[PDB]
Design a protein around this ligand. Structure first.
Ligand SMILES: [Ca+2]
Ligand SMILES: [Ca+2]
Length: 279
């Protein structure tokens, strides 16, 4: 299956309506919300429990973390990507019991986006003064500070037989933003067939990507087409759009918006647990 740029790529709200009108792509019965399960739910035999969080934004003190096997964090684990914030997050990870902790970057991890960092100091450096102060040596090893994680960036890991792929890019003045269309499709084309769990920082079109204040959809159209038509992971986890915290299905893939922080800037949305059968 070859994904090409959608005719509605640049206009996600119109893409949503187009596909809903013609194909009922976002309609019941197959597309619907999925209620969360409480942390005392027994894990089914032969399954692994994923604990999904995102957009913790250095506010990890006091998050009540549930029993599970593998943590998935879908980015914005810092405010600015400062090396000290990355260290604090890594320290928090090392105290969690989970066998594996898988992490991707998001928009706030400015120091992880080498193009952003190179551009910032040549332009309006005073838009991010604490970041602009950093010397090249201060952030050349930033991802290496995540010693308690497996860090993914357009890359994958097989853990307990699960194929997990992660990428930070979003279609939205922050890090890891790319123009809608081919620029993002080039990234999504890297996701392999056979991926069980896809981690991206933001949503695909139509799944937990409505922004009330803007009355628009903001998910990536190319990512949706890739997920449903080519890759078909069992789980697509993401954050970014805090208003969309919660879970949906399309009948095959489960979509989890794991945004921990709310529009009130507090990390009060509970971690979401999700069980998958072992390969
Ligand atoms: Ca260094
Ligand atoms: Ca918060």
């Amino acid at each position: 299956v070859t994904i090409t740029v959608d005719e509605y790529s640049s206009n996600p709200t119109q893409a949503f309506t187009h596909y809903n009108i013609n194909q009922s792509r976002f309609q019941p019965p197959h597309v619907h919300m999925v209620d969360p399960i409480p942390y005392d739910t027994p894990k089914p035999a032969g399954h692994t429990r994923f604990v999904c969080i995102s957009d913790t934004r250095s506010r990890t003190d006091g998050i009540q973390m549930p029993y599970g096997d593998i943590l998935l964090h879908t980015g914005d684990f810092t405010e600015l990507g400062l090396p000290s914030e990355v260290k604090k997050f890594n320290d928090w990870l090392g105290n969690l019991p989970y066998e594996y902790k898988i992490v991707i970057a998001g928009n706030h991890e400015l120091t992880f986006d080498k193009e952003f960092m190179a551009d910032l100091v040549k332009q309006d450096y005073y838009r991010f003064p604490s970041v602009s102060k950093l010397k090249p040596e201060d952030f050349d090893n930033v991802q290496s500070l995540l010693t308690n994680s497996i860090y993914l960036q357009d890359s994958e890991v097989t853990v307990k037989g699960f194929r997990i792929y992660g990428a930070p890019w979003t279609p939205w003045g922050w890090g890891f933003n790319l123009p809608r269309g081919q620029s993002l499709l080039d990234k999504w084309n890297l996701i392999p067939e056979g991926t069980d769990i896809l981690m991206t920082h933001g949503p695909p079109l139509g799944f937990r990507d409505w922004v009330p204040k803007e009355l628009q959809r903001v998910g990536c159209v190319e990512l949706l087409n890739t997920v449903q038509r080519r890759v078909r992971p069992k789980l697509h986890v993401f954050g970014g759009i805090h208003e969309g915290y919660g879970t949906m299905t399309d009948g095959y893939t489960t979509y989890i918006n794991a945004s921990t922080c709310t529009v009130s800037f507090q990390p009060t949305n509970p971690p979401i647990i999700f069980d998958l059968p072992n390969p």
